[PDB]
Design a protein around this ligand. Sequence first.
Ligand SMILES: *CCC(=O)N1CC(NC(=O)Cn2c(C3CC3)c(C(=O)N3CCc4c(cccc4OC)C3)c3cc(Cl)cc(C)c32)C1
Ligand SMILES: Nc1nc2c(ncn2[C@@H]2O[C@H](COP(=O)(O)OP(=O)(O)O)[C@@H](O)[C@H]2O)c(=O)[nH]1
Ligand SMILES: [Ca+2]
Ligand SMILES: [Ca+2]
Length: 165
Amino acid sequence: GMTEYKLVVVGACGVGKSALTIQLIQNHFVDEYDPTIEDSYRKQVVIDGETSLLDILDTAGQAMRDQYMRTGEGFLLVFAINNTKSFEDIHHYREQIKRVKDSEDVPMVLVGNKSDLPSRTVDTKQAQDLARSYGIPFIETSAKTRQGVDDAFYTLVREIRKHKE
Ligand SMILES: *CCC(=O)N1CC(NC(=O)Cn2c(C3CC3)c(C(=O)N3CCc4c(cccc4OC)C3)c3cc(Cl)cc(C)c32)C1
Ligand SMILES: Nc1nc2c(ncn2[C@@H]2O[C@H](COP(=O)(O)OP(=O)(O)O)[C@@H](O)[C@H]2O)c(=O)[nH]1
Ligand SMILES: [Ca+2]
Ligand SMILES: [Ca+2]
């Protein structure tokens, strides 16, 4: 009966939801993943000395969403730093989560993915400011280089712990 955390990764098509999830678990960068595959992925982690099982839903669908959202304990809000629309979508993802959870206090982390890319359309400042207003952590990640990937998920677990403690 080990501690489990139900995590849900959300965000627009092509932001790197699958790449982040697979990097975390497999330590491998998928250069392309079938965008129709929605599945749960398991990971055993130790975070600040506490061992736990992560049950991570990598969302892809475009019914049972309400249920995974309802049972989800923490949400990774992923955008890509070279996709302004994906950043604008964040607001709506957050709103839907609050709506179905019927709670203003839901563990979430804002993730700006593709930090390895030489060009970007979303400033760090913009993302930092948004996260500041939401009162949630902001992490820049690269599923390719692995920069910040562990930290993004670990930070989400720490937010879930705070919420429960
Ligand atoms: C290319 C395949 C892929 O990765 N994806 C992600 C995208 N699928 C979803 O976003 C499914 N979805 C929705 C559906 C309307 C799109 C919602 C939702 O109800 N939102 C509220 C309205 C809204 C959202 C995002 C952008 C713009 C919006 O309206 C202006 C979000 C979802 C909420 C969550 Cl928490 C998760 C998911 C998967 C989701 C195809
Ligand atoms: N350069 C770079 N490419 C990435 C990164 N993360 C994902 N990608 C690529 O962007 C595309 C979309 O990634 P994917 O995980 O399928 O996005 P999803 O639709 O959100 O699940 C794929 O070609 C990935 O290889 C990243 O951190 N850096
Ligand atoms: Ca995907
Ligand atoms: Ca907060």
